[PDB]
Design an enzyme around this catalytic site. Structure first.
Site, short mmCIF file in Angstrom:
data_model
loop_
_atom_site.label_atom_id
_atom_site.label_comp_id
_atom_site.label_asym_id
_atom_site.label_seq_id
_atom_site.Cartn_x
_atom_site.Cartn_y
_atom_site.Cartn_z
N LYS A 149 -4.34 8.35 2.08
CA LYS A 149 -5.19 8.00 3.08
C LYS A 149 -5.44 8.38 4.20
CE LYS A 149 -7.95 5.43 -0.11
NZ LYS A 149 -8.68 6.20 -1.28
N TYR A 197 0.71 -1.07 -0.11
CA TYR A 197 0.25 0.06 0.10
C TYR A 197 0.87 1.22 0.07
CZ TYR A 197 -4.63 2.24 0.14
OH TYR A 197 -5.79 3.09 0.12
N1 LIG Z 1 -11.06 -2.09 -3.18
C1 LIG Z 1 -10.65 -1.54 -2.30
O1 LIG Z 1 -10.60 -2.50 -1.32
C2 LIG Z 1 -10.98 -0.28 -1.87
C3 LIG Z 1 -11.06 0.05 -0.58
C4 LIG Z 1 -11.32 1.39 -0.20
C5 LIG Z 1 -11.38 2.54 -0.79
N2 LIG Z 1 -11.23 2.31 -2.50
C6 LIG Z 1 -11.33 3.66 -2.86
O2 LIG Z 1 -12.59 4.00 -3.57
C7 LIG Z 1 -12.37 4.67 -4.92
C8 LIG Z 1 -12.36 3.53 -5.84
O3 LIG Z 1 -12.29 2.35 -5.80
P1 LIG Z 1 -12.38 1.27 -7.16
O4 LIG Z 1 -11.97 -0.04 -6.47
O5 LIG Z 1 -13.52 1.18 -7.48
O6 LIG Z 1 -11.19 1.64 -8.08
P2 LIG Z 1 -11.66 1.65 -9.55
O7 LIG Z 1 -10.32 2.09 -10.39
O8 LIG Z 1 -12.20 0.30 -10.12
O9 LIG Z 1 -12.53 2.89 -9.69
C9 LIG Z 1 -12.10 4.28 -9.17
C10 LIG Z 1 -12.23 5.31 -9.91
O10 LIG Z 1 -11.35 6.48 -9.39
C11 LIG Z 1 -11.04 6.80 -10.83
N3 LIG Z 1 -10.16 8.41 -10.91
C12 LIG Z 1 -8.62 8.46 -11.13
N4 LIG Z 1 -8.42 9.49 -11.33
C13 LIG Z 1 -9.45 10.23 -11.25
C14 LIG Z 1 -9.63 11.54 -10.97
N5 LIG Z 1 -8.64 12.48 -11.49
N6 LIG Z 1 -10.92 12.27 -11.07
C15 LIG Z 1 -11.93 11.50 -11.02
N7 LIG Z 1 -11.70 10.07 -10.79
C16 LIG Z 1 -10.59 9.50 -11.02
C17 LIG Z 1 -10.37 5.82 -11.29
O11 LIG Z 1 -10.13 5.98 -12.69
C18 LIG Z 1 -11.49 5.14 -11.35
O12 LIG Z 1 -12.59 5.33 -12.22
C19 LIG Z 1 -10.90 5.21 -4.64
O13 LIG Z 1 -11.07 6.18 -3.88
C20 LIG Z 1 -10.43 4.22 -3.67
O14 LIG Z 1 -9.44 4.69 -3.10
C21 LIG Z 1 -10.80 0.87 -2.99
C1 LIG Z 2 -6.25 -4.56 -1.05
C2 LIG Z 2 -6.30 -3.44 -2.07
C3 LIG Z 2 -7.20 -2.42 -1.20
C4 LIG Z 2 -7.43 -1.37 -2.16
C5 LIG Z 2 -7.47 -1.40 -3.52
C6 LIG Z 2 -7.65 -0.48 -4.25
C7 LIG Z 2 -7.93 0.67 -3.64
O1 LIG Z 2 -8.32 1.76 -4.43
C8 LIG Z 2 -7.08 2.35 -4.95
C9 LIG Z 2 -5.94 1.41 -5.10
C10 LIG Z 2 -4.86 1.88 -5.38
C11 LIG Z 2 -4.41 3.34 -5.69
C12 LIG Z 2 -5.53 4.47 -5.40
C13 LIG Z 2 -6.76 3.85 -5.20
C14 LIG Z 2 -7.74 1.23 -2.39
O2 LIG Z 2 -7.78 2.50 -1.83
C15 LIG Z 2 -7.63 -0.21 -1.41
#
Ligand SMILES: NC(=O)c1ccc[n+]([C@@H]2O[C@H](COP(=O)([O-])OP(=O)(O)OC[C@H]3O[C@@H](n4cnc5c(N)ncnc54)[C@H](O)[C@@H]3O)[C@@H](O)[C@H]2O)c1
Ligand SMILES: CCCc1ccc(Oc2ccccc2)c(O)c1
Ligand SMILES: NC(=O)c1ccc[n+]([C@@H]2O[C@H](COP(=O)([O-])OP(=O)(O)OC[C@H]3O[C@@H](n4cnc5c(N)ncnc54)[C@H](O)[C@@H]3O)[C@@H](O)[C@H]2O)c1
Ligand SMILES: NC(=O)c1ccc[n+]([C@@H]2O[C@H](COP(=O)([O-])OP(=O)(O)OC[C@H]3O[C@@H](n4cnc5c(N)ncnc54)[C@H](O)[C@@H]3O)[C@@H](O)[C@H]2O)c1
Ligand SMILES: NC(=O)c1ccc[n+]([C@@H]2O[C@H](COP(=O)([O-])OP(=O)(O)OC[C@H]3O[C@@H](n4cnc5c(N)ncnc54)[C@H](O)[C@@H]3O)[C@@H](O)[C@H]2O)c1
Ligand SMILES: CCCc1ccc(Oc2ccccc2)c(O)c1
Ligand SMILES: CCCc1ccc(Oc2ccccc2)c(O)c1
Ligand SMILES: CCCc1ccc(Oc2ccccc2)c(O)c1
Lengths: 257, 257, 257, 257
Positions: free
Chosen positions: C162, C155
């Site tokens: 975050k 991470y």
């Molecule tokens: N999968 C995980 O466990 C997890 C956990 C916590 C938070 N998230 C968070 O939720 C959000 C998205 O998760 P996700 O899994 O759907 O990832 P994802 O890539 O499938 O979708 C996230 C979106 O944020 C978009 N993005 C990137 N740059 C951007 C910008 N300049 N303006 C607007 N949008 C932009 C990405 O392109 C993507 O479309 C993120 O904030 C990420 O930190 C993921």
């Molecule tokens: C175990 C992975 C957990 C996780 C996956 C995707 C996530 O969304 C991302 C990932 C990387 C960069 C920016 C946003 C996340 O916040 C957290």
């Protein structure tokens, strides 16, 4: 050293593996003058040796389960020491069921009561009972564990006692902080002690922590001893109500991935 | 003392009220050998005195905003010291708008960038840049504030830098813990320093804390100095990734009721 | 349902696996009226479908890296909606080096800047930029992760973004709480999304969590969707500044022992 | 609504100002079917009305101090309901001394025991005692307070009970999470209830919070009711082991400066 001339009462010294043991060494090594407690007449002899090893001739019985002994303890002590500068609470206990296997399987009104009485209540109990002879720079210190903040296998009811104990630290700090007294806890990592015998797969945890701690090693009573001397000393004169992790940084990671 | 023969590089020493000042005293007082940094050629003279006062002749420029100087810093240092035993990061900064009044009113991509670049990034930046000459018992220490964990009036963007800084402490501890290096932060209480001039009603906070802290008093750079020496020392050899509050216990209460 | 007639702007909807996707479903399903954003002209077509699927005809470009688009976004939106009732920030990004392998190995002033600019700054950025058309019961919601509070393998820099993001939640809640606006974050468990592709051994984590979470299973975007609707809704009218874990309880244990 | 057909047992309903009251309303309002408990034969009549008001004819005595009644409770209930889908623990008590004035002044082995027995132990006690008839989607929910995590004037021993209670939430989640059962707590803000009569200067706290909370207002049992319905429902199917603040965001700031 930084404990020169400070008079510190230590409880919970049972073996040479005891956490309280490493804290005595560290204190003696820094100029401290020590006094000790024991439970039951059948340990009276062992603690007397241990006390001799630290140039002390002061040993006192104290079953923290008995209002009587807790009060006797500080009456006795008062005739030898004019005032108290440090108290170490290195006391924990739980019925064997309550720290074995399933949480709910070991739960009973009685076990809960006992674990909370001995491991949690006793700390502020002793405090109230020392208040009279405590000095103005005095420092209280108790031992705790990460199981208070996160669910650890087998810890179970001990987990709850320890949460209550750590809350008492805060309420103590406020109550006694007026008089200049500081109150702190150390959150220690897994150390193979007698008390640790009751935690099944203690060996599993200890191994896990050695693998995943940031420092990649286990802690020792000397490391814990050293932090405690600090908290008991005037170097930590700005530190009250803290719960200080001493566990090679284990609390801070998510291990095993 | 417990720092005998340790070589420690200190940053952020600006006045005799600086937190970094009290940490130098405490370190010197414990047998430490010190080196210092400064920003800009127009402070070169002041830091040279300060360094003399701690028996040091080692002063180095370092604008943590410049990759160049951070690298120059440890190249220079390397010719004098064979290895580094401790680094103190006592560096914070935010555009004046970003720490005045309304949070959103002082917010701009630029302020944010700056406050995070200087107050947060710089710490692990320096670490990577010292990795080469760091020793095996080495200890890193940064300064932080309660505003990272709770919304404090006026702190604003500094709040976010400080949350990122504290997260870096954990990621650092993991990264460097392999090599035996420890990383920690002290969470200090309000202390009237030059940096503190930019927090309006700093006087309001300071008074509040003196009223409601469990110890009922404000902290000093000596108290903070003393805790820092400890963390830099081998007494704290079991302590990594910790954020240690030194604030008369203020974090622990809810004041003003 | 509990979102009847609320107008909610959703960002970060990229695939049908996106977290922002499950939150849209949940919102639509509860009577919400939706609007969406996208990045770059080459996604303009995909988001238009997705929007159709939720009875929406409102799609807007917004590279959160550009002051221009963020401002354009709410100017545009203003001509369609009189006021805004909910904003979802589902946006994260970090250069690939910064979330691969060793923390210090992926560290550079540039990566840090970028990850913090996009993942952290953007949230309060958007807020300031919506302040004008926000309503009095309005609710802001961002996504976060446990890696802000504990060092997770790989991470790395995302960890620091975050932590800053979560601090902004608190400073936002204070800033906007005056006007009746609520600000919250959900701390989600591992979910296989596009963004998750950049976390090596994501499969390792996901498996680990399924083994050790109290509920013994992984979360889904529907579960996260459902919690989000709640926070966006007036059911949560007493809930601001919270960071709500939705991860089968994983944060609460110590796994793998 | 989101509780359609769910059968929920509510405890601690005493007045129409009770927190348990607002949670009943919120549950009934969402399709829930309710059952209630009372303490002593002299309240049997009042709860019967209250139950009628929610279309329930199920009222059961339960002094959580008596193993006998806790067991009777679920035997009785079993003949009416085949299985249980939700249990609300809205139970707290401490001898009047233990929540008045000085912490140490109200401390006695007896008060401690009682406050922990009734406010802390009873929650997992009831859980073990329901385990048999609990369903697979079942959800447990208890009430807690910020005083568990920070020293609040007058709270004293209640502070420790509440820390232990919140630790039990985690150990419960693990123990029952295997069977699909979720366990959560809500951390509520100050609400003028009967129990609240014993907190001197409750009026001082309540006023303080209204001044300094981010939302600048006090919470209500409807707000708390609404969050509880959520946690009891399958919307929160990804949420276990959480402690959810519902207090206009008060925990998140440092007030009065
Ligand atoms: N999968 C995980 O466990 C997890 C956990 C916590 C938070 N998230 C968070 O939720 C959000 C998205 O998760 P996700 O899994 O759907 O990832 P994802 O890539 O499938 O979708 C996230 C979106 O944020 C978009 N993005 C990137 N740059 C951007 C910008 N300049 N303006 C607007 N949008 C932009 C990405 O392109 C993507 O479309 C993120 O904030 C990420 O930190 C993921
Ligand atoms: C175990 C992975 C957990 C996780 C996956 C995707 C996530 O969304 C991302 C990932 C990387 C960069 C920016 C946003 C996340 O916040 C957290
Ligand atoms: N072993 C570990 O890894 C570890 C970690 C963190 C905290 N601890 C805590 O440190 C403390 C000390 O445990 P230890 O590990 O040094 O093991 P230990 O057995 O050496 O110390 C335990 C002490 O508790 C004392 N005690 C038990 N019942 C008592 C009573 N009724 N009255 C007075 N004293 C009583 C025992 O006599 C013993 O001296 C405990 O409180 C424990 O919770 C241990
Ligand atoms: N007084 C408080 O209560 C308090 C609490 C916690 C942390 N601090 C922290 O301790 C550090 C300093 O505190 P202070 O009160 O002595 O402030 P100070 O201004 O008196 O000294 C801090 C030093 O950091 C310096 N600095 C600024 N930019 C720098 C750069 N690019 N490279 C190196 N150094 C730079 C400042 O110029 C100053 O010399 C900061 O990190 C600050 O965040 C202060
Ligand atoms: N008032 C607040 O601001 C507040 C805030 C947070 C949490 N709480 C918590 O919420 C819960 C409910 O308190 P409340 O504020 O609704 O006041 P309340 O008096 O309306 O509820 C308290 C309930 O505890 C019950 N109780 C007491 N002793 C009992 C026993 N021996 N066996 C079974 N039940 C018993 C009472 O009968 C009463 O119904 C408590 O657990 C309390 O700690 C109250
Ligand atoms: C899991 C190891 C950490 C630990 C070990 C032993 C401990 O000592 C105990 C445990 C149970 C009952 C009484 C005392 C402890 O508190 C914490
Ligand atoms: C009450 C003020 C607390 C405080 C004062 C000075 C501090 O040092 C600063 C201040 C502003 C910007 C950068 C670094 C600090 O971190 C915290
Ligand atoms: C300070 C107000 C918050 C609060 C008020 C009343 C509460 O209910 C009590 C308090 C003491 C004993 C028994 C029940 C409570 O838990 C929390």
């Amino acid at each position: 050293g930084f404990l020169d001339g400070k008079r510190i009462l230590l409880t919970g010294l049972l073996s040479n593996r005891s956490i309280a043991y490493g804290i005595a060494k560290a204190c003696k090594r820094e100029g401290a003058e020590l006094a000790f407690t024991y439970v039951g007449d059948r340990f009276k002899d062992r603690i007397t040796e241990f006390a001799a090893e630290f140039g002390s001739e002061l040993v006192f019985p104290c079953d923290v389960a008995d209002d009587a002994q807790i009060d006797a303890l500080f009456a006795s002590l008062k005739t030898h020491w004019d005032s108290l500068d440090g108290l170490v609470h290195s006391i924990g206990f739980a019925p064997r069921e309550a720290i074995a296997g399933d949480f709910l399987d070991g739960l009973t009104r009685e076990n809960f009561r006992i674990a909370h009485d001995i491991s949690a209540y006793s700390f502020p109990a002793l405090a109230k009972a020392a208040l009279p002879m405590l000095s103005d720079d005095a420092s209280l210190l108790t031992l705790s564990y990460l199981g208070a903040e996160r669910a650890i296998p087998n810890y179970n009811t001990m987990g709850l006692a320890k949460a209550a104990l750590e809350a008492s630290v805060r309420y103590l700090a406020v109550s006694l902080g007026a008089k200049g007294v500081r109150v702190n806890a150390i959150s220690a990592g897994p150390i193979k002690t007698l008390a640790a015998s009751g935690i099944k797969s203690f060996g599993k945890i200890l191994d896990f922590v050695e693998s995943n701690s940031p420092l990649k090693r286990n802690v020792t009573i000397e490391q814990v001893g050293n932090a405690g001397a600090f908290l008991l000393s005037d170097l930590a004169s700005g530190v009250t109500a803290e719960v200080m992790h001493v566990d090679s940084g284990f609390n801070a990671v998510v291990g095993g991935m």
